[PDB]
RNA sequence: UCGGGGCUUAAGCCCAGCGCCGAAGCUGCGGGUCUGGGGGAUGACCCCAGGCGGUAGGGGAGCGUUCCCGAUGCCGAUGAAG
RNA sequence: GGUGAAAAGAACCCCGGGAGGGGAGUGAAAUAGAGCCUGAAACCGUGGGCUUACAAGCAGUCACGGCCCCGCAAGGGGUUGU
């Protein structure tokens with residue numbers, strides 16, 4: 001009968017964002033958010049590392065993107081569809097662009113959100129120097 | 138000779154109603170609703186029974202692949218090494234060794250890296 | 255009957271949930287100074303009277 | 307111990323009186339008499355009626371101390387409804403249930 | 419020490435003194451059968467070739483039995499098709515004793 | 520809004536290679552039933568090979584309900600039916 | 602259409618205007634109390650165990666996990682978080 005892990009401790013990680021290609025980084029970030037790298041992986045628990053990102057304001061992204069490529073929010077009201085280009089996202093709160101990527105990469109369930117909270121993204125550098133600052137690339 | 142219904146109907150009913158204990162609302166009180174639900178239930182079980190295997194095969198893979206990843210190679214190549222090295226032993230389930238008794242998993246990694254080339 | 259009608263018998267759960275706020279509150283009472291008895295505040299009550 | 311008292315066939319809807327009963331469940335006999343003494347519902351009269359009888363039974367039959375007993379539990383049950391025909395428009399007609407209640411109140415000694 | 423052993427088309431990790439339910443074997447209800455099938459150990463037997471040529475695991479057939487019944491309900495809509503089969507899978511319990519190899 | 524996120528010496532397109540994932544298909548292990556074929560003199564039973572999605576519909580084998588013979592019987596207050 | 606073998610149909614006391622109850626008493630039984638044998642289901646309610654207020658649902662099913670409960674015990678029952 002297959003092994004079930006018990007209450008273990010979350011491994012807090014720290015990733016430097018600047019230079020990294022947006023989507024490419026998000027993918028790995030997501031994987032870390034779930035277990036999926038720890039061989040005691042369990043799909044219904046929440047055991048992914050606490051990823052911390054810094055210098056997110058400096059994420060690289062190929063092609064025209066920034067100019068083109070737009071994020072759309074929808075208010076409930078008529079015409080309530082807002083459209084905001086990648087450019088202006090970074091202009092203001094930029095950690096958004098990475099978050100909206102990692103979030104869209106997490107499973108959509110009630111667990112998915114638990115995990116989305118373990119992801120801490122900052123304009124960086126610097127952040128809550130709690131405990132582990134295990135540089136990672 | 139007249140054969141009333143009598144016990145017969147009630148009894149066949151109570152049976153199903155037993156099977157439905159625990160279901161939401163009318164679904165565990167009404168015989169007609171109960172049967173209908175059971176119909177669905179039985180079919181689900183039979184199909185989840187088929188899936189259950191297909192489910193663990195997957196779980197194992199990830200756990201194996203996770204251990205292979207930290208051990209240098211990936212799952213794809215790992216299996217190949219093993220499949221080539223004749224070590225048909227490790228059924229993807231028993232590759233739970235990755236979780237406990239890692240030195241054995243490790244031993245099994247080199248055997249695969251050996252069979253590579 | 256004519257025009258609008260309920261599309262479905264409301265469930266046991268839905269009914270009672272609606273009746274969430276049905277529970278009435280107990281009366282508010284205070285002991286009058288004259289007797290040890292209980293009376294609703296700001297009200298003269300028989301079996302006692304008043305100080306004019 | 308505990309003292310029971312039941313008034314059956316009370317000509318009033320259960321759902322209605324039930325509102326009053328829930329008001330005094332667990333309460334002490336003292337605050338209870340008061341809660342009904344000043345509750346603004348028809349059910350009061352009936353629930354009080356059975357509550358006071360429960361008391362009498364408690365003491366005159368079980369040596370229980372009046373000034374020491376509470377409402378260990380109480381509940382109201384539905385009795386056989388009186389169905390009546392209500393003439394309606396365009397000749398249609400329908401029955402209206404003048405429902406009915408079974409009010410039980412069971413008292414009990416405070417502590418020991 | 420560990421011991422990966424296959425039987426009844428399936429494999430199991432096994433310690434001595436372990437009780438284990440397995441695909442019904444043909445054996446005296448209280449006899450002794452060693453699973454001439456084996457892979458791995460507590461100190462890495464590691465079966466290069468499929469099996470570990472020269473090794474075995476002694477086990478005492480503790481008894482035979484039948485599993486809890488499972489209702490396999492089949493049902494199709496629009497076409498009044500329903501089937502109810504009761505299924506209890508036969509099995510034999512083993513007691514693992516030696517792991518000599 | 521390409522299913523989404525997201526992707527630009529690609530996560531796009533084309534050419535070549537190796538490996539892996541994967542369905543109730545196939546394999547293994549156990550069980551069931553049908554048919555054919557083998558021993559069993561034997562009824563029993565075992566062995567081997569193969570078949571078993573299904574509506575209209577045809578065929579086969581059963582389960583339960585009331586009543587009758589079995590009843591001047593047997594069970595039943597140490598408790599019938601329900 | 603049905604109390605019970607028999608009315609033995611509940612004196613008397615207690616709460617209540619009464620109804621209806623609580624004691625007492627009858628009976629094998631009163632969960633046989635009078636529309637009274639057995640008393641199924643829908644339906645209504647009281648108590649208790651598990652559970653639920655960031656979550657999108659033919660209401661189940663598969664897995665794991667927690668709480669509660671029956672065998673101190675390897676087991677099983679209830680519940681439902683993911």
Ligand SMILES: [Mg+2]
Nearest residue numbers: 027028031036
């Ligand atoms: Mg990856």
Ligand SMILES: [Mg+2]
Nearest residue numbers: 071100101104
């Ligand atoms: Mg987004």
Ligand SMILES: [Mg+2]
Nearest residue numbers: 043107109111
């Ligand atoms: Mg998921």
Ligand SMILES: [Mg+2]
Nearest residue numbers: 106107108109
């Ligand atoms: Mg989905």
Ligand SMILES: [Mg+2]
Nearest residue numbers: 108109110657
């Ligand atoms: Mg959502």
Ligand SMILES: [Mg+2]
Nearest residue numbers: 140141142143
């Ligand atoms: Mg009929």
Ligand SMILES: [Mg+2]
Nearest residue numbers: 162163166266
């Ligand atoms: Mg219900």
Ligand SMILES: [Mg+2]
Nearest residue numbers: 165166167643
């Ligand atoms: Mg019900």
Ligand SMILES: [Mg+2]
Nearest residue numbers: 194195198229
């Ligand atoms: Mg597989």
Ligand SMILES: [Mg+2]
Nearest residue numbers: 266267270271
């Ligand atoms: Mg309710």
Ligand SMILES: [Mg+2]
Nearest residue numbers: 266267270646
């Ligand atoms: Mg309720």
Ligand SMILES: [Mg+2]
Nearest residue numbers: 314315316620
């Ligand atoms: Mg009356």
Ligand SMILES: [Mg+2]
Nearest residue numbers: 328329331332
């Ligand atoms: Mg209450």
Ligand SMILES: [Mg+2]
Nearest residue numbers: 313316352355
């Ligand atoms: Mg009254």
Ligand SMILES: [Mg+2]
Nearest residue numbers: 362363366615
């Ligand atoms: Mg009295």
Ligand SMILES: [Mg+2]
Nearest residue numbers: 367368623624
């Ligand atoms: Mg008494």
